[PDB]
Ligand binder design. Structure first.
Ligand SMILES: *[C@@H]1O[C@H](CO)[C@@H](O[C@@H]2O[C@H](CO)[C@@H](O[C@@H]3O[C@H](CO)[C@@H](O)[C@H](O)[C@@H]3O)[C@H](O)[C@H]2NC(C)=O)[C@H](O)[C@H]1NC(C)=O
Length: 154
């Protein structure tokens, strides 16, 4: 699966990549249809050995971020909704002659410093979907924060 490698920083940090690295969009003609569609992002509680038993963006309650301008109000009782202020999820625009895996630019902006971990960690799996008019295609990916052990680290 796709692993997004994030270098821990003391400042905010934006990340641009193509949604169809994550979402099963299909061939190029299908990706071009998806270019103008909205995307959404769901944090998951699955690990590497349980990926197949926690389906991603399975209900509306798992959606914490969307590429819409109006900001998505997460589910009050979803435990991972607290991650909401740490991430902004936006949609880019692609040229009309866009090429494979380059018609759906999205941006993940980590709004907090990352040298230390957040109380619910950002280092986890995430689901991504495309707001389409048939069954939304849904994929997942791993957000991996780099680590560098300190000198006094035991
Ligand atoms: C995030 O970092 C990991 C490594 O910690 C990347 O995983 C590895 O990515 C490389 C690059 O695509 C994959 O192939 C590589 O090919 C080069 C040929 O120059 C070779 O020198 C490397 O040793 C490696 O074989 C590799 O399959 C993949 N997995 C492993 C275990 O290395 C990952 O790609 C990075 N994420 C992104 C978005 O780049």
């Amino acid at each position: 699966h796709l692993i997004i490698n994030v270098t821990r920083s003391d400042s905010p940090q934006t990340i641009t990549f193509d949604a169809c690295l994550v979402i099963p969009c299909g061939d190029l003609q299908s990706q071009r249809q998806l270019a103008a569609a909205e995307k959404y992002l769901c944090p998951s509680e699955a690990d590497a050995s349980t990926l197949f038993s926690f389906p991603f963006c399975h209900t509306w309650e798992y959606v914490v971020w969307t590429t819409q301008r109006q900001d998505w109000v997460p589910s009050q009782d979803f435990p991972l909704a607290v991650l909401k202020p740490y991430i902004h999820f936006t949609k880019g625009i692609a040229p009309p002659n866009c090429r494979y895996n380059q018609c759906n630019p999205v941006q993940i902006s980590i709004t907090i410093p990352t040298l230390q971990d957040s109380s619910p960690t950002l280092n986890r799996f995430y689901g991504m979907g495309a707001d389409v008019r048939g069954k939304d295609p849904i994929g997942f990916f791993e957000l991996h924060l780099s680590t560098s052990p300190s000198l006094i680290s035991p």
